[PDB]
Design a binder for this molecule. Sequence first.
Ligand SMILES: [Mg+2]
Ligand SMILES: [Mg+2]
Ligand SMILES: [Mg+2]
Ligand SMILES: [Mg+2]
Ligand SMILES: [Mg+2]
Ligand SMILES: [Mg+2]
Ligand SMILES: [Mg+2]
Ligand SMILES: [Mg+2]
Ligand SMILES: [Mg+2]
Ligand SMILES: [Mg+2]
Ligand SMILES: [Mg+2]
Ligand SMILES: [Mg+2]
Ligand SMILES: [Mg+2]
Ligand SMILES: [Mg+2]
Ligand SMILES: [Mg+2]
Ligand SMILES: [Mg+2]
Ligand SMILES: [Mg+2]
Ligand SMILES: [Mg+2]
Ligand SMILES: [Mg+2]
Ligand SMILES: [Mg+2]
Ligand SMILES: [Mg+2]
Ligand SMILES: [Mg+2]
Ligand SMILES: [Mg+2]
Ligand SMILES: [Mg+2]
Ligand SMILES: [Mg+2]
Ligand SMILES: [Mg+2]
Ligand SMILES: [Mg+2]
Ligand SMILES: [Mg+2]
Ligand SMILES: [Mg+2]
Ligand SMILES: [Mg+2]
Ligand SMILES: [Mg+2]
Ligand SMILES: [Mg+2]
Ligand SMILES: [Mg+2]
Ligand SMILES: [Mg+2]
Ligand SMILES: [Mg+2]
Ligand SMILES: [Mg+2]
Ligand SMILES: [Mg+2]
Ligand SMILES: [Mg+2]
Ligand SMILES: [Mg+2]
Ligand SMILES: [Mg+2]
Ligand SMILES: [Mg+2]
Ligand SMILES: [Mg+2]
Ligand SMILES: [Mg+2]
Ligand SMILES: [Mg+2]
Ligand SMILES: [Mg+2]
Ligand SMILES: [Mg+2]
Ligand SMILES: [Mg+2]
Ligand SMILES: [Mg+2]
Ligand SMILES: [Mg+2]
Ligand SMILES: [Mg+2]
Ligand SMILES: [Mg+2]
Ligand SMILES: [Mg+2]
Ligand SMILES: [Mg+2]
Ligand SMILES: [Mg+2]
Ligand SMILES: [Mg+2]
Ligand SMILES: [Mg+2]
Ligand SMILES: [Mg+2]
Ligand SMILES: [Mg+2]
Ligand SMILES: [Mg+2]
Ligand SMILES: [Mg+2]
Ligand SMILES: [Mg+2]
Ligand SMILES: [Mg+2]
Ligand SMILES: [Mg+2]
Ligand SMILES: [Mg+2]
Ligand SMILES: [Mg+2]
Ligand SMILES: [Mg+2]
Ligand SMILES: [Mg+2]
Ligand SMILES: [Mg+2]
Ligand SMILES: [Mg+2]
Ligand SMILES: [Mg+2]
Ligand SMILES: [Mg+2]
Ligand SMILES: [Mg+2]
Ligand SMILES: [Mg+2]
Ligand SMILES: [Mg+2]
Ligand SMILES: [Mg+2]
Ligand SMILES: [Mg+2]
Ligand SMILES: [Mg+2]
Ligand SMILES: [Mg+2]
Ligand SMILES: [Mg+2]
Ligand SMILES: [Mg+2]
Ligand SMILES: [Mg+2]
Ligand SMILES: [Mg+2]
Ligand SMILES: [Mg+2]
Ligand SMILES: [Mg+2]
Ligand SMILES: [Mg+2]
Ligand SMILES: [Mg+2]
Ligand SMILES: [Mg+2]
Ligand SMILES: [Mg+2]
Ligand SMILES: [Mg+2]
Ligand SMILES: [Mg+2]
Ligand SMILES: [Mg+2]
Ligand SMILES: [Mg+2]
Ligand SMILES: [Mg+2]
Ligand SMILES: [Mg+2]
Ligand SMILES: [Mg+2]
Ligand SMILES: [Mg+2]
Ligand SMILES: [Mg+2]
Ligand SMILES: [Mg+2]
Ligand SMILES: [Mg+2]
Ligand SMILES: [Mg+2]
Ligand SMILES: [Mg+2]
Ligand SMILES: [Mg+2]
Ligand SMILES: [Mg+2]
Ligand SMILES: [Mg+2]
Ligand SMILES: [Mg+2]
Ligand SMILES: [Mg+2]
Ligand SMILES: [Mg+2]
Ligand SMILES: [Mg+2]
Ligand SMILES: [Mg+2]
Ligand SMILES: [Mg+2]
Ligand SMILES: [Mg+2]
Ligand SMILES: [Mg+2]
Ligand SMILES: [Mg+2]
Ligand SMILES: [Mg+2]
Ligand SMILES: [Mg+2]
Ligand SMILES: [Mg+2]
Ligand SMILES: [Mg+2]
Ligand SMILES: [Mg+2]
Ligand SMILES: [Mg+2]
Ligand SMILES: [Mg+2]
Ligand SMILES: [Mg+2]
Ligand SMILES: [Mg+2]
Ligand SMILES: [Mg+2]
Ligand SMILES: [Mg+2]
Ligand SMILES: [Mg+2]
Ligand SMILES: [Mg+2]
Ligand SMILES: [Mg+2]
Ligand SMILES: [Mg+2]
Ligand SMILES: [Mg+2]
Ligand SMILES: [Mg+2]
Ligand SMILES: [Mg+2]
Ligand SMILES: [Mg+2]
Ligand SMILES: [Mg+2]
Ligand SMILES: [Mg+2]
Ligand SMILES: [Mg+2]
Ligand SMILES: [Mg+2]
Ligand SMILES: [Mg+2]
Ligand SMILES: [Mg+2]
Ligand SMILES: [Mg+2]
Ligand SMILES: [Mg+2]
Ligand SMILES: [Mg+2]
Ligand SMILES: [Mg+2]
Ligand SMILES: [Mg+2]
Ligand SMILES: [Mg+2]
Ligand SMILES: [Mg+2]
Ligand SMILES: [Mg+2]
Ligand SMILES: [Mg+2]
Ligand SMILES: [Mg+2]
Ligand SMILES: [Mg+2]
Ligand SMILES: [Mg+2]
Ligand SMILES: [Mg+2]
Ligand SMILES: [Mg+2]
Ligand SMILES: [Mg+2]
Ligand SMILES: [Mg+2]
Ligand SMILES: [Mg+2]
Ligand SMILES: [Mg+2]
Ligand SMILES: [Mg+2]
Ligand SMILES: [Mg+2]
Ligand SMILES: [Mg+2]
Ligand SMILES: [Mg+2]
Ligand SMILES: [Zn+2]
Lengths: 181, 110, 53, 84, 141
Amino acid sequence: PLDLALKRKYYEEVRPELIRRFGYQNVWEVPRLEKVVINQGLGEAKEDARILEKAAQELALITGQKPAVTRAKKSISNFKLRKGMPIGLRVTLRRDRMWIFLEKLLNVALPRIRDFRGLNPNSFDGRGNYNLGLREQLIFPEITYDMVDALRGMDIAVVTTAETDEEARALLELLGFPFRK
Amino acid sequence: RLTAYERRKFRVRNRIKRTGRLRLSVFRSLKHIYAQIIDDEKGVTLVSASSLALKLKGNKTEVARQVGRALAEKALALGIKQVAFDRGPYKYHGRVKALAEGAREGGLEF
Amino acid sequence: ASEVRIKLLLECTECKRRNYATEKNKRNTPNKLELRKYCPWCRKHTVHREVKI
Amino acid sequence: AHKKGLGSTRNGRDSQAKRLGVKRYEGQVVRAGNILVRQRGTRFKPGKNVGMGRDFTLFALVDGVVEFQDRGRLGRYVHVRPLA
Amino acid sequence: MLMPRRMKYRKQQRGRLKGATKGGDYVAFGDFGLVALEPAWITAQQIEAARVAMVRHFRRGGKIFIRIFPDKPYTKKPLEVRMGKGKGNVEGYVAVVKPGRVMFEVAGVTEEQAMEALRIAGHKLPIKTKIVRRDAYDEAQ
RNA sequence: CGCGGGGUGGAGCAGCCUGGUAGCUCGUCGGGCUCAUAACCCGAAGGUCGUCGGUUCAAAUCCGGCCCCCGCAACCA
RNA sequence: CGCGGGGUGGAGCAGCCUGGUAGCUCGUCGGGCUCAUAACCCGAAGGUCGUCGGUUCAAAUCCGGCCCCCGCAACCA
RNA sequence: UCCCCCGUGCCCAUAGCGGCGUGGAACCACCCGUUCCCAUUCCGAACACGGAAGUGAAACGCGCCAGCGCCGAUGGUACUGGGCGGGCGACCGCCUGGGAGAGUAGGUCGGUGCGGGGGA
RNA sequence: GGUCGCCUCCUAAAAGGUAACGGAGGCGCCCAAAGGUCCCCUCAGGCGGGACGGAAAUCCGCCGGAGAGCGCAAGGGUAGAAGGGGGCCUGACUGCGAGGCCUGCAAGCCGAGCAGGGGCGAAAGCCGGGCCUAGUGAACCGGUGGUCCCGUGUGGAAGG
RNA sequence: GUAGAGCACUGAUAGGGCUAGGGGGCCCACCAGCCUACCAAACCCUGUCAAACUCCGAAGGGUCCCAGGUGGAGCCUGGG
Ligand SMILES: [Mg+2]
Ligand SMILES: [Mg+2]
Ligand SMILES: [Mg+2]
Ligand SMILES: [Mg+2]
Ligand SMILES: [Mg+2]
Ligand SMILES: [Mg+2]
Ligand SMILES: [Mg+2]
Ligand SMILES: [Mg+2]
Ligand SMILES: [Mg+2]
Ligand SMILES: [Mg+2]
Ligand SMILES: [Mg+2]
Ligand SMILES: [Mg+2]
Ligand SMILES: [Mg+2]
Ligand SMILES: [Mg+2]
Ligand SMILES: [Mg+2]
Ligand SMILES: [Mg+2]
Ligand SMILES: [Mg+2]
Ligand SMILES: [Mg+2]
Ligand SMILES: [Mg+2]
Ligand SMILES: [Mg+2]
Ligand SMILES: [Mg+2]
Ligand SMILES: [Mg+2]
Ligand SMILES: [Mg+2]
Ligand SMILES: [Mg+2]
Ligand SMILES: [Mg+2]
Ligand SMILES: [Mg+2]
Ligand SMILES: [Mg+2]
Ligand SMILES: [Mg+2]
Ligand SMILES: [Mg+2]
Ligand SMILES: [Mg+2]
Ligand SMILES: [Mg+2]
Ligand SMILES: [Mg+2]
Ligand SMILES: [Mg+2]
Ligand SMILES: [Mg+2]
Ligand SMILES: [Mg+2]
Ligand SMILES: [Mg+2]
Ligand SMILES: [Mg+2]
Ligand SMILES: [Mg+2]
Ligand SMILES: [Mg+2]
Ligand SMILES: [Mg+2]
Ligand SMILES: [Mg+2]
Ligand SMILES: [Mg+2]
Ligand SMILES: [Mg+2]
Ligand SMILES: [Mg+2]
Ligand SMILES: [Mg+2]
Ligand SMILES: [Mg+2]
Ligand SMILES: [Mg+2]
Ligand SMILES: [Mg+2]
Ligand SMILES: [Mg+2]
Ligand SMILES: [Mg+2]
Ligand SMILES: [Mg+2]
Ligand SMILES: [Mg+2]
Ligand SMILES: [Mg+2]
Ligand SMILES: [Mg+2]
Ligand SMILES: [Mg+2]
Ligand SMILES: [Mg+2]
Ligand SMILES: [Mg+2]
Ligand SMILES: [Mg+2]
Ligand SMILES: [Mg+2]
Ligand SMILES: [Mg+2]
Ligand SMILES: [Mg+2]
Ligand SMILES: [Mg+2]
Ligand SMILES: [Mg+2]
Ligand SMILES: [Mg+2]
Ligand SMILES: [Mg+2]
Ligand SMILES: [Mg+2]
Ligand SMILES: [Mg+2]
Ligand SMILES: [Mg+2]
Ligand SMILES: [Mg+2]
Ligand SMILES: [Mg+2]
Ligand SMILES: [Mg+2]
Ligand SMILES: [Mg+2]
Ligand SMILES: [Mg+2]
Ligand SMILES: [Mg+2]
Ligand SMILES: [Mg+2]
Ligand SMILES: [Mg+2]
Ligand SMILES: [Mg+2]
Ligand SMILES: [Mg+2]
Ligand SMILES: [Mg+2]
Ligand SMILES: [Mg+2]
Ligand SMILES: [Mg+2]
Ligand SMILES: [Mg+2]
Ligand SMILES: [Mg+2]
Ligand SMILES: [Mg+2]
Ligand SMILES: [Mg+2]
Ligand SMILES: [Mg+2]
Ligand SMILES: [Mg+2]
Ligand SMILES: [Mg+2]
Ligand SMILES: [Mg+2]
Ligand SMILES: [Mg+2]
Ligand SMILES: [Mg+2]
Ligand SMILES: [Mg+2]
Ligand SMILES: [Mg+2]
Ligand SMILES: [Mg+2]
Ligand SMILES: [Mg+2]
Ligand SMILES: [Mg+2]
Ligand SMILES: [Mg+2]
Ligand SMILES: [Mg+2]
Ligand SMILES: [Mg+2]
Ligand SMILES: [Mg+2]
Ligand SMILES: [Mg+2]
Ligand SMILES: [Mg+2]
Ligand SMILES: [Mg+2]
Ligand SMILES: [Mg+2]
Ligand SMILES: [Mg+2]
Ligand SMILES: [Mg+2]
Ligand SMILES: [Mg+2]
Ligand SMILES: [Mg+2]
Ligand SMILES: [Mg+2]
Ligand SMILES: [Mg+2]
Ligand SMILES: [Mg+2]
Ligand SMILES: [Mg+2]
Ligand SMILES: [Mg+2]
Ligand SMILES: [Mg+2]
Ligand SMILES: [Mg+2]
Ligand SMILES: [Mg+2]
Ligand SMILES: [Mg+2]
Ligand SMILES: [Mg+2]
Ligand SMILES: [Mg+2]
Ligand SMILES: [Mg+2]
Ligand SMILES: [Mg+2]
Ligand SMILES: [Mg+2]
Ligand SMILES: [Mg+2]
Ligand SMILES: [Mg+2]
Ligand SMILES: [Mg+2]
Ligand SMILES: [Mg+2]
Ligand SMILES: [Mg+2]
Ligand SMILES: [Mg+2]
Ligand SMILES: [Mg+2]
Ligand SMILES: [Mg+2]
Ligand SMILES: [Mg+2]
Ligand SMILES: [Mg+2]
Ligand SMILES: [Mg+2]
Ligand SMILES: [Mg+2]
Ligand SMILES: [Mg+2]
Ligand SMILES: [Mg+2]
Ligand SMILES: [Mg+2]
Ligand SMILES: [Mg+2]
Ligand SMILES: [Mg+2]
Ligand SMILES: [Mg+2]
Ligand SMILES: [Mg+2]
Ligand SMILES: [Mg+2]
Ligand SMILES: [Mg+2]
Ligand SMILES: [Mg+2]
Ligand SMILES: [Mg+2]
Ligand SMILES: [Mg+2]
Ligand SMILES: [Mg+2]
Ligand SMILES: [Mg+2]
Ligand SMILES: [Mg+2]
Ligand SMILES: [Mg+2]
Ligand SMILES: [Mg+2]
Ligand SMILES: [Mg+2]
Ligand SMILES: [Mg+2]
Ligand SMILES: [Mg+2]
Ligand SMILES: [Mg+2]
Ligand SMILES: [Mg+2]
Ligand SMILES: [Mg+2]
Ligand SMILES: [Mg+2]
Ligand SMILES: [Mg+2]
Ligand SMILES: [Mg+2]
Ligand SMILES: [Zn+2]
């Protein structure tokens, strides 16, 4: 479909290591990335400016996909929040577009962050998936300083077929996910 | 618990069953497509046409059209002409559509 | 009804007869009501518009 | 003498009776149009030759004989078998 | 003083007291119990009164069980006023007891001690009563 | 027993009708003037709205019960 | 239903008859004087002149519609 | 006319949850691809189309086991239509017919219809 | 003093109905989408993981039959949709109406089907407002728009 | 959909277990270890309660068909 870097490392290096490590019988048993979802939980743009599209153009830039809106489920008073208010962005990366984002993340994003000292090991799902948080977003290379108004974080979730954290730990560690402890 | 698959099925099937007409049901596997005609009063298939049984092949849509046409042949012979189309969990489009389009000019009233 | 949910007639633009009577919210939908409706006089359909009750 | 500081009653009302229920039973002969069940929600569901009105009223669509059916989890149904 | 913490409804219709007790007819906790012989609305005042009497009797010792609870609101119209103009007010809570219902139980106190204590208790209750010992029949239930 | 009103910073009153936001005067505390006190000037703190429930995204505000205060009523014999 | 006249800055407001100026008082800001307080005095921010369409070189000023507040009188089976 | 599979009804958990095992010849499914039809408030996930390299890992089909869930007698009793009796009274009791709920024994890892494809 | 019509629940004794100044609550509105249809989607809640971010904003995972939602009180109903999103639309039709529910009258209620001219749908089909049950007022008197039926010898006009 | 009965729903409920949080003391505090004959949500076991609770549920009651029933029965129209 498209020859890419990280997909090669998975298929030509990560795969076999996993097999010899847990002794998978069948081929599809071998754990693999299903999808990567980015979610900028804004709501800072609630009643406020529709200039969440600045964060949206910034988003589509990083991912190469157009981001969708997320709106208020229930209204909450303590949050100054009306049910239906636009309060976030979410974009779902699958197949090749996933592989590209992950390559630029493990290689260029994650190092360029202030005082990187490893990903949290305990942050594993319990049924094979993994979650992390960024606060910057100029951290991605295609975002120069001039494009930014104010900072903005995002919620990355990465989903694998791994039955458990162990298998998941390995699939990620082997790809290039640097862990802290 | 229910898949959206099953929910769609019931939802479109039940509506048709209420109109009391004969029912042209359809199955659309990855490799074939099948279409039987059912009297839900008695719970019985009156006539059936399929790709596997036709020993047919040559692009899914163009194939699908024929099984419809073939279905009409055996149907009209028996007396069946009036019928309702169970489009199953499948969007009325492409392959399923072609089956309908064929079965239409094949003589079926629907 | 109320001062705000008001009553009104629908008048056929073709032949000016009022053939239907209904309501609307004045605040919510403040424009005159445009609607196709059957005319028994013209014996076809017709764009009818709102008319003060 | 007697009639001292008594009281009052903050409630004390009700609505009119609505005469709901099954109106024709299993085995009863019926004309098309006959009301079969007055109800709130589908406590019964329309079956063969039975239609349902906007307030959930069940009526016969054909002359025939009324027939009931409990299909367990699928609910209860009123039918009308036509007559030859 | 027993009474519900919260209540779905504040006033409750009176009802009859048909039949024997619905259940709670076998000893379930201690060795001896007090059984109702005739039915009644047992006031929350009476429950408490019996309770205290036993407690007091064997000062510090044993454990008292109470198998009845006043959840029925008891109504009373004011003095010297006439019929009508609404239902009276809630003025206390009773527990509906019926013959066969074990109402109290005691344990971990000597047989003689239990007998007197349960006996005094019954004297507080508005009905005829009997003491009973835990049976093979009770443990079977 | 009945009917109407009320309870909000230490005192005395607004805000409730129309739900989102707590005001006024006094007092108080800190700093000025004065030899000193007051008057006077500058600056500040202080309530989680009688009490339980309920409605609501949200309650001093809307709804039910209870408690305390206030006014009216309580006649024919 | 039928009449009469208003909307102009944060509050009230003559400018409208007679088309060339968004002006006045009070309000807030800064400065002068002050035992201080006011009052006095100098300056200053603050408006699409209800809307939309229209005659006009130009109109809050004049027209048509429409919104809204007040006002006048009558009717209410 | 026995076996396996596919579509589809009926009985509506004795059919379900969970566990363990089995199945790719065929069917079916995941699967391969995004040119075309169609599609995503983002994503070929879904829907859709063109395919057949791989795999039964998932899903599904078929088994097996009774932890769960579900079903659940007989016997007895509550209550009761009708007919009576005792007690000042509170309430009890009798005949006749009907007869639960709970619980006990125990059952269950479905049964069947019509069509299609493939077998021995 | 309280109440007076309508709706929901109990009282109501397993059909319907049933009283009291018996026990609890609601209504006198609302929506041009909260309506018609076609297509798609499925809750609440719990646990785990996740920058700002909390009990609760938005994202991921597993569980979950309905305890959510259905404008509003309650009941019944309901995910095999009546709920959530979208596309196109005005059937929130006109002329009728076999047959019944309810019922003292007068009211109230459900309704297939026929014709006209439409809507959405490939189609079967659905559509004569809204998940349903409250959201209301006989007749008399008058207003407004139609029609062109009567109109005092005739044609107009007044008035019906 | 009652009598009875039941707790699966809406609430109530005594004891015990388990266990968020809350309180007293300790360590003494900055965060954490607290251990607790106290208070206690959720949950589990024993044991119960309810007109406006029901996983259940009779006896009866209602209506329809067939049969008996000829009675100061019954049905239709009208006068009092
Ligand atoms: Mg590619
Ligand atoms: Mg490899
Ligand atoms: Mg925010
Ligand atoms: Mg389920
Ligand atoms: Mg679906
Ligand atoms: Mg559906
Ligand atoms: Mg059948
Ligand atoms: Mg060929
Ligand atoms: Mg052709
Ligand atoms: Mg034909
Ligand atoms: Mg035209
Ligand atoms: Mg208007
Ligand atoms: Mg027209
Ligand atoms: Mg007297
Ligand atoms: Mg009095
Ligand atoms: Mg009062
Ligand atoms: Mg009622
Ligand atoms: Mg009535
Ligand atoms: Mg009544
Ligand atoms: Mg219908
Ligand atoms: Mg009905
Ligand atoms: Mg039957
Ligand atoms: Mg059945
Ligand atoms: Mg069911
Ligand atoms: Mg069903
Ligand atoms: Mg159902
Ligand atoms: Mg308590
Ligand atoms: Mg009694
Ligand atoms: Mg009994
Ligand atoms: Mg008895
Ligand atoms: Mg007895
Ligand atoms: Mg009892
Ligand atoms: Mg002792
Ligand atoms: Mg005694
Ligand atoms: Mg004994
Ligand atoms: Mg013994
Ligand atoms: Mg035991
Ligand atoms: Mg007053
Ligand atoms: Mg008043
Ligand atoms: Mg007052
Ligand atoms: Mg008062
Ligand atoms: Mg008060
Ligand atoms: Mg106050
Ligand atoms: Mg005070
Ligand atoms: Mg005052
Ligand atoms: Mg008040
Ligand atoms: Mg007020
Ligand atoms: Mg001082
Ligand atoms: Mg001084
Ligand atoms: Mg509150
Ligand atoms: Mg407030
Ligand atoms: Mg409150
Ligand atoms: Mg208050
Ligand atoms: Mg209060
Ligand atoms: Mg006098
Ligand atoms: Mg006198
Ligand atoms: Mg003035
Ligand atoms: Mg054989
Ligand atoms: Mg089968
Ligand atoms: Mg069966
Ligand atoms: Mg099942
Ligand atoms: Mg297991
Ligand atoms: Mg096992
Ligand atoms: Mg094994
Ligand atoms: Mg095995
Ligand atoms: Mg094996
Ligand atoms: Mg093969
Ligand atoms: Mg190609
Ligand atoms: Mg292309
Ligand atoms: Mg193209
Ligand atoms: Mg299209
Ligand atoms: Mg397209
Ligand atoms: Mg959007
Ligand atoms: Mg779009
Ligand atoms: Mg399996
Ligand atoms: Mg086992
Ligand atoms: Mg078992
Ligand atoms: Mg069952
Ligand atoms: Mg038995
Ligand atoms: Mg027996
Ligand atoms: Mg008997
Ligand atoms: Mg009897
Ligand atoms: Mg007797
Ligand atoms: Mg006697
Ligand atoms: Mg006796
Ligand atoms: Mg006898
Ligand atoms: Mg006898
Ligand atoms: Mg018997
Ligand atoms: Mg008997
Ligand atoms: Mg077995
Ligand atoms: Mg099983
Ligand atoms: Mg099994
Ligand atoms: Mg078997
Ligand atoms: Mg057979
Ligand atoms: Mg009065
Ligand atoms: Mg009854
Ligand atoms: Mg609206
Ligand atoms: Mg769709
Ligand atoms: Mg959708
Ligand atoms: Mg959730
Ligand atoms: Mg969480
Ligand atoms: Mg969160
Ligand atoms: Mg913050
Ligand atoms: Mg989410
Ligand atoms: Mg529930
Ligand atoms: Mg909710
Ligand atoms: Mg539901
Ligand atoms: Mg519900
Ligand atoms: Mg279902
Ligand atoms: Mg829908
Ligand atoms: Mg939705
Ligand atoms: Mg939704
Ligand atoms: Mg919707
Ligand atoms: Mg919408
Ligand atoms: Mg729509
Ligand atoms: Mg279209
Ligand atoms: Mg209308
Ligand atoms: Mg006829
Ligand atoms: Mg006729
Ligand atoms: Mg009538
Ligand atoms: Mg009505
Ligand atoms: Mg049509
Ligand atoms: Mg379609
Ligand atoms: Mg068409
Ligand atoms: Mg409609
Ligand atoms: Mg509605
Ligand atoms: Mg409505
Ligand atoms: Mg009325
Ligand atoms: Mg009159
Ligand atoms: Mg008139
Ligand atoms: Mg008239
Ligand atoms: Mg004439
Ligand atoms: Mg004339
Ligand atoms: Mg004349
Ligand atoms: Mg004339
Ligand atoms: Mg006229
Ligand atoms: Mg029931
Ligand atoms: Mg009922
Ligand atoms: Mg339940
Ligand atoms: Mg309930
Ligand atoms: Mg509950
Ligand atoms: Mg509880
Ligand atoms: Mg407890
Ligand atoms: Mg405990
Ligand atoms: Mg503590
Ligand atoms: Mg301490
Ligand atoms: Mg400390
Ligand atoms: Mg320290
Ligand atoms: Mg600490
Ligand atoms: Mg600290
Ligand atoms: Mg410190
Ligand atoms: Mg410890
Ligand atoms: Mg009841
Ligand atoms: Mg009951
Ligand atoms: Mg049963
Ligand atoms: Mg059962
Ligand atoms: Mg039953
Ligand atoms: Mg039985
Ligand atoms: Mg029966
Ligand atoms: Mg006979
Ligand atoms: Zn017309």
